[PDB]
Amino acid sequence: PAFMFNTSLTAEEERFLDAAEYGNIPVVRKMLEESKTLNVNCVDYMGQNALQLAVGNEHLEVTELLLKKENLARIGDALLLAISKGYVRIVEAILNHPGFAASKRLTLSPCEQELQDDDFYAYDEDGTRFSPDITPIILAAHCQKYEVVHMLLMKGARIERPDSFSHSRSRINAYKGLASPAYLSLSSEDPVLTALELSNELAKLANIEKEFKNDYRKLSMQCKDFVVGVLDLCRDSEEVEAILNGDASLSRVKLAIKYEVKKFVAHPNCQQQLLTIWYENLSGLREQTIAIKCLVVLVVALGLPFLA
Amino acid sequence: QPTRYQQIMKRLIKRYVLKAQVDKENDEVNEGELKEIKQDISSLRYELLEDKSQATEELAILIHKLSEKL
Amino acid sequence: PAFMFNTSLTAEEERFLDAAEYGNIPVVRKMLEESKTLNVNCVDYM
Amino acid sequence: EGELKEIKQDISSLRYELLEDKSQATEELAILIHK
C-alpha cells in the first residue's frame, strides 16, 4: 500500500493486539503481567493500539486490564471513542484514570486544550480522531449520550459557549454541542428558555454566516424541536402553564412567536390554552358551529353603535 | 429551597430525558451494535473456555497427587 | 448539573445497583441474603 | 435498539451466572491431604 498507517509488528505484539481486539481477557492479562518485552502501545495496520481496539469493540474487561497498566498511551482518544460509541461503563472506567481524575482536562476550555499542547486527545503521530476543538463534553452532546453528558457535567465539564476556517468549524462544533437536547436538558435550570434563546441566536448566526447557513438552521431546528417536545410531555394544566407562562402572561408563547418557533405555538397543549384565553367569557360560544358565529357577527354588525 | 416552578421543570426534564432514551431504544439497529454483541459473545467464549481450562487443571492436579499416592 | 434526578450513593449500594442493572444474579442474591446495611430502594443517578 | 439491548443484557446475565464462584467443592476435595 502507498500508505503505512502504522516494526513489522512482531508475533508477540500481533498476538497481543489480536487478543485485545477480540476480547481475549485471560491472554491480555497474561501478556500484561508475565511478558517483559511487550510494549502496550503497539499499533495495528490502522495505527490503533490495544486500548483503542478494546474500546472500539466494547471490551470493558480488556479496557480495565489496560488501564491498570502504566505508560499506556492514547488514553484521551480512547475516552473520545468510548463517548462517541456511548459506552457508559468504558467512559466511567477511563474517567477514573490518573490522566483525568488527577488532572483537570475535562474542566479546561477547548482553547486551553489547544494551548496546552498535551498531545492527549490524539490518535496517531499527528492528528486527532475528531476535530481538535471537540472536548469530551462537546462530543457527548453531539452524540446525545445523556448518561455520558451527566457524568461529564458532574466532573465539571462545560461547553465553551464561544486560520479563519478552523475557527468557524470550532464555533459550529460548540453550537452543535449547545443545541443538543442531551445538553440543553441537563445543563441549564430552565431548559425551555435556554433553548428558545439559543434558537434565536442560531437563527441570527445562520443569517450572518451564509456558507454554514444549513448547519445553524439545523441547530435552530433542533432547539425548536426540543422546546416542542418538552411542551408535548406536559400531562396537566399546571405543567402546561409552567411551560407557557414561564416562571396569565404567556411569556414563552410570545417568545416562540418572536423567535419563529411555530410548532411550539401550534401545539395542541398550547392551542388549548390559547383557545381558553381567546374565549374569556364566551364559554358557550366556543363549541358553537360556524353558522352561529357568522350570525353573531352579523348581529354585532347590526348593533355596533348600540354596543359602543 | 426549590420553588413550585423548579419542581415542575425538573419533573418535565426528567420525563423528557426518559422519553428521549426510550425513543433512542426505538431506533433501527445498526451494524456496529450487532458487532458489539458479537464481541460480547467472543469475550464470553474466551472467559468460559479459560474457566474450563482452570477447572480441568485443578482436577488434573488432584489425579496426579492421587496417582502418586497409589 | 442543574437538575439532580436522584446520599452520595455509598459503594455498597453502587455495586448493588450495578449488579441489579446488569443481571449479576449471584451478587444480588448474596447482597439480599447476607447484607443488612443495604437499602434495596436505593436509586441511581436517574 | 431496545431488543438488542435486551439480548446484550441476557448475554451479560448468562456470563455472570456461568462465572459464579463454585470452586469450593474442589477446594473441599483437598481432604485428599487426609489421604
Partner: nanobody, 122 residues
C-alpha cells in the same frame, strides 16, 4: 515484576487486633481474584480469605467473622483486618492474585510477594 512487599509486619498481644496491606491490583469487571494465605510453621499453606472481582468475600471457617478482607476504591491495594487475633492466627502471611472466578480454590494463585511477619504473645 510488580514489587509489593506485603506490609503490616509486627507483633501484638493475643486477643487484640492488627492490620495488613498488600499492593495487589484488583479488577471490577475482569474476573480476577485476590486473597491472603497463611503459611504456619510446621503446617502448610491455607486460604485465610479471598475477595472476588465483584467484592464477594469468602473466609475460612476458622477465621469466619473475625477477619475482614477488603480493598480501596482504586483496588490497587489489598487490606486484611484481623480482630481477636488468637494464638492460632500466626504465620508468614502471603498475598496472592489469580485470574478467573475460582477465588475460593487455592490452586492457581501467584505468591510473588516476599511476605509479612505476624506473631502473637500469649
Amino acid at each position: 515484576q510488580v514489587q509489593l512487599q506485603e506490609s503490616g509486619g509486627g507483633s501484638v498481644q493475643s486477643g487484640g487486633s492488627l492490620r495488613l496491606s498488600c499492593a495487589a491490583s484488583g479488577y471490577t469487571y475482569s474476573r480476577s481474584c485476590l486473597g491472603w494465605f497463611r503459611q504456619a510453621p510446621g503446617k502448610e499453606r491455607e486460604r485465610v480469605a479471598t475477595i472476588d472481582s465483584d467484592g464477594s468475600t469468602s473466609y475460612a471457617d476458622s477465621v469466619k467473622g473475625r477477619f475482614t478482607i477488603s480493598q480501596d476504591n482504586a483496588k490497587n491495594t489489598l487490606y486484611l483486618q484481623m480482630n481477636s487475633l488468637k494464638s492460632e492466627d500466626t504465620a508468614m502471611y502471603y498475598c496472592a492474585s489469580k485470574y478467573g472466578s475460582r477465588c475460593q480454590n487455592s490452586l492457581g494463585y501467584m505468591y510473588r510477594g516476599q511476605g509479612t511477619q505476624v506473631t502473637v504473645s500469649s
